[PDB]
Design a protein around this ligand. Structure first.
Ligand SMILES: Cc1cc(CN)nn1C
Ligand SMILES: [Ca+2]
Length: 223
C-alpha cells in the first residue's frame, strides 16, 4: 500500500497473509474454513496466517493453518488476468473471534464513488522498494467504468473495476495481491493488477467479486 496508513493491530480481522516460507499475497477470510484471494497468487505449499499484524513477529493473536486445497476460477486467464479469483480451503476451521473474523460477500455490486478500505503488507513506495511488517490501510473510492477503461485502453473487462486516485500518490502495490477491497462491510474487490503503483492516471485494478458470489457459494457447498 502506497500513501496509506498503519491500520492498527487486528483492526482488519478478515485480512490474511498467505505464506510459503514468506508472505507472498493477501487474502480474505469468508468463513471459518475458506479464504478468497487472487488466482495470480496460486502456488503449492500455502499456509494461511490469520490474526496477523506484524508478519515478522509472533504477537499472540495469530492462527497458522495449512491449506488443504486451492481452487482457481475455471475461466482464469493469466495473460489478461480476467477472472482473477481463487478459493483456498483451510485444513482445519479457524477459531473465529473479534480479531479473526469473516467478511460478508456482496449481495449486489458496488457503484462508482463507493468508499472502500484496501489493505495489505505490500510495497509502500511508488519509486523504490520498502516492505512494511505491519498491516497498511488505504481508504479509496471505486472509479467509474469509463474512467477505468480510459486509464487502461483494451484491458478492463466486466470482471474488473478501478479504485483509487487518478492524481496518483495512493494505491495498492506489489505484495498486496489477493487482498481485500471492502465497502460497507462487504468484500467487493480483490487486489489484482496495475501499472506500477500510485502513478498518475494508473489506478489499481480489482477483481469484481459480486460477479463470483454464485461460484463461491456453490464451490464451498461441494468442497
Ligand atoms: C498487486 C498490485 C496492485 C497494483 C496496483 N497498483 N499493482 N500490483 C502489482
Ligand atoms: Ca505476527
Amino acid at each position: 500500500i502506497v500513501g496509506g496508513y498503519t491500520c492498527g493491530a487486528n483492526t482488519v480481522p478478515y485480512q490474511v497473509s498467505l505464506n510459503s516460507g514468506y508472505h507472498f499475497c493477501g487474502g480474505s477470510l469468508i468463513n471459518s474454513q475458506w479464504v478468497v484471494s487472487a488466482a495470480h497468487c496460486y502456488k503449492s505449499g500455502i499456509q494461511v496466517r490469520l490474526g496477523e499484524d506484524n508478519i515478522n513477529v509472533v504477537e499472540g493473536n495469530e492462527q497458522f493453518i495449512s491449506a488443504s486445497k486451492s481452487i482457481v476460477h475455471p475461466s482464469y486467464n493469466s495473460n489478461t488476468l480476467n477472472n482473477d479469483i481463487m478459493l483456498i480451503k483451510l485444513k482445519s476451521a479457524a477459531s473465529l473471534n473479534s480479531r479473526v473474523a469473516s467478511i460478508s460477500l456482496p449481495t449486489s455490486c458496488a457503484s462508482a464513488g463507493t468508499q472502500c478500505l484496501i489493505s495489505g503488507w505490500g510495497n509502500t513506495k511508488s519509486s523504490g522498494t520498502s516492505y512494511p511488517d505491519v498491516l497498511k490501510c488505504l481508504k479509496a473510492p471505486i472509479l467509474s467504468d469509463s474512467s477505468c477503461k480510459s486509464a487502461y485502453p483494451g484491458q478492463i473487462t466486466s470482471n474488473m473495476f478501478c479504485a483509487g486516485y487518478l492524481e496518483g500518490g495512493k494505491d495498492s502495490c506489489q505484495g498486496d495481491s489477493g487482498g481485500p477491497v471492502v465497502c460497507s462491510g462487504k468484500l467487493q474487490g480483490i487486489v489484482s493488477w496495475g501499472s506500477g503503483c500510485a502513478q498518475k492516471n494508473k489506478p489499481g485494478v480489482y477483481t469484481k467479486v459480486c460477479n463470483y458470489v454464485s461460484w463461491i457459494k456453490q464451490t464451498i457447498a461441494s468442497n
